[PDB]
Design an enzyme around this catalytic site. Structure first.
Site, PDB file in Angstrom:
ATOM      1  CB  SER A 146      42.771  33.574  44.841  1.00  0.00           C
ATOM      2  OG  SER A 146      41.483  33.797  44.279  1.00  0.00           O
ATOM      3  CG  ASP A 338      48.984  37.462  47.851  1.00  0.00           C
ATOM      4  OD1 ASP A 338      48.253  38.430  47.974  1.00  0.00           O
ATOM      5  OD2 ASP A 338      48.570  36.224  47.784  1.00  0.00           O
ATOM      6  CB  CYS A 341      46.642  33.182  48.808  1.00  0.00           C
ATOM      7  SG  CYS A 341      44.826  33.177  48.818  1.00  0.00           S
ATOM      8  CG  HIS A 397      46.231  37.272  44.902  1.00  0.00           C
ATOM      9  ND1 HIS A 397      46.243  36.365  45.948  1.00  0.00           N
ATOM     10  CD2 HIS A 397      45.102  37.141  44.177  1.00  0.00           C
ATOM     11  CE1 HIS A 397      45.129  35.681  45.841  1.00  0.00           C
ATOM     12  NE2 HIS A 397      44.420  36.132  44.785  1.00  0.00           N
ATOM     13  CG  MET A 398      47.033  38.962  40.825  1.00  0.00           C
ATOM     14  SD  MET A 398      45.741  39.876  39.994  1.00  0.00           S
ATOM     15  CE  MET A 398      44.611  39.993  41.406  1.00  0.00           C
TER      16      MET A 398
END
Ligand SMILES: *[C@H]1O[C@H](CO)[C@@H](O)[C@H](O)[C@H]1NC(C)=O
Ligand SMILES: *[C@H]1O[C@H](CO)[C@@H](O)[C@H](O)[C@H]1NC(C)=O
Ligand SMILES: *[C@H]1O[C@H](CO)[C@@H](O)[C@H](O)[C@H]1NC(C)=O
Length: 421
Positions: A146, A338, A341, A397-398
């Site tokens: 991120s 996600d 991003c 995102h992760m």
């Protein structure tokens, strides 16, 4: 003053070490939590994990996406069935200052440049005390997610800036990061408007809203780019984040995973609640021997200052080119589920960054990549020399949190496999 996790549950066998590295004159207290390779620390590389925020603790990646331990209601450790250090000694730094467990009495850190500046000051103090990771010719790299997509390059220069250095950097890993806002910013409408895997989440009305709101947003990114003034970067942030991030937020979909839903206010990922829980505990706060009284994940202040400084909108994407120019192997990877991003936008920024192999990179065709471990297509490559852009199939995102098998797959193979996918 440092203690060993030898005291906490966490990762037995291997040999972990934690504590603080201090900086006299500046009064800055870095906090870290290391782990030695589950295999051979002597051979196995070295890794710097970095979370974003800005102003968020890195422990979070530890107990939440790719570390060895995990957080159960029980506030009882858990072993990761696909940990990151499975084949490499990892470092969990708490930057910036006043983040997670680090601290200070009076500093700054209202920007990125100066942060790396401290980070390099710690990488040299750490390597010092544990010189046991270089001499042996131990490949050291850095990774983050991120906002670290801002940090990383900037820190990467900083470091390489010193010929003076007490260590060697081998590569960079950036997951679902903010890097070249100017370019990534148009990928907001497309990704939410039904064009990047999951389907349209916003009424076409809302979509056209983003498309009008765009031109203006962008000229703002430019001005910031070329000027680097507060006067432009600040409104560029607020305006753009407005026009483009909020409509999605209204819907109350998760921001880190279009598939999952999360309404405004509460957590999108509650389990992280238990985490801030386990950290503050009396036994757990002991071991580590951290000199802090109350641990928070993120620090509003830090976030605020970065925002009020222009940060978010500065063209740190520039650094990427230098590094590429300085023949540094780079890996830009994106969870394809996600919104914050996207892989759409990280895709493209890559597809246009300038560097020597500029035209060749844009020529090279996309290929389906097979997970090292599980034997299944896991994403999509675009490779050219030391510069590779991978799209992680079914990732949020992760990415490590979502697909551990694949992450490590993608991990070791890049760490080991000869800086290529
Ligand atoms: C790292 O660990 C395992 C286990 O003891 C080993 O089998 C494997 O070959 C190692 N490294 C890689 C990338 O294959
Ligand atoms: C990095 O490793 C050590 C650290 O100070 C240094 O002696 C060596 O010259 C460096 N590596 C090079 C040649 O790139
Ligand atoms: C990716 O590989 C080829 C790409 O040209 C395609 O035929 C296939 O659908 C993809 N692989 C899968 C999804 O098994």
């Amino acid at each position: 003053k440092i203690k060993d996790p030898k005291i906490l549950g966490i990762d037995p066998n291997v040999t972990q070490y934690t504590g603080y590295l201090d900086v006299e004159d500046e009064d800055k207290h870095f906090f870290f939590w290391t782990f030695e390779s589950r295999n051979d620390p002597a051979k196995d590389p070295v890794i710097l994990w970095l979370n974003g925020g800005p102003g968020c603790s890195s422990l979070t990646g530890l107990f939440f996406e790719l570390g060895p331990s995990s957080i159960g209601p029980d506030l009882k450790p858990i072993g990761n069935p696909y940990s990151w250090n499975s084949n490499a000694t990892v470092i969990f730094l708490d930057q910036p200052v006043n983040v997670g467990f680090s601290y200070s009495g009076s500093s700054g850190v209202s920007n990125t440049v100066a942060a790396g500046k401290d980070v390099y000051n710690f990488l040299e103090l750490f390597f010092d005390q544990f010189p046991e990771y270089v001499n042996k010719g131990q490949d050291f790299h850095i990774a983050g997610e991120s906002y670290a997509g801002h940090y990383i390059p900037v820190f990467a220069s900083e470091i390489l800036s010193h010929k003076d250095r007490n260590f060697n950097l081998t590569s960079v890993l950036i997951g679902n990061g903010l890097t070249d806002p100017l370019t990534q910013y148009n990928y907001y409408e497309p990704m939410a408007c039904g064009e990047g895997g999951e389907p349209s989440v916003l009424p076409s009305e809302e979509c056209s809203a983003m498309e009008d709101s765009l031109e203006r947003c962008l000229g703002l990114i430019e001005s910031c780019y070329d000027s680097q003034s507060v006067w432009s970067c600040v409104p560029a942030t607020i305006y753009c984040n407005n026009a483009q991030l909020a409509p999605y937020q209204r819907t109350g979909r998760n921001v880190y995973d279009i598939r999952k839903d999360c309404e405004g206010g509460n957590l999108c990922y509650p389990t992280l609640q238990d985490i801030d829980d386990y950290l503050n505990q009396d036994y757990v706060k002991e071991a580590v021997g951290a000199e802090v009284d109350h641990y928070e994940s993120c620090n509003f202040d830090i976030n605020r200052n970065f925002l009020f400084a222009g940060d978010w909108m500065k063209p740190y994407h520039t650094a990427v080119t230098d590094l590429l120019n300085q023949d540094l192997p780079i890996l830009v990877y994106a969870g394809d589920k996600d919104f914050i991003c996207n892989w759409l936008g990280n895709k493209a920024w890559t597809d246009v960054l300038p560097w020597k192999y500029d035209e060749e990179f844009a020529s090279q065709k996309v290929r389906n990549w097979t997970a090292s471990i599980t034997d299944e297509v896991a994403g999509e490559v675009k490779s050219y020399k030391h510069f590779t852009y991978l799209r992680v199939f079914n990732g949020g995102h992760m990415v490590p949190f979502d697909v551990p098998e694949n992450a490590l797959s993608m991990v070791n193979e890049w760490i080991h496999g000869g800086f290529s996918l």
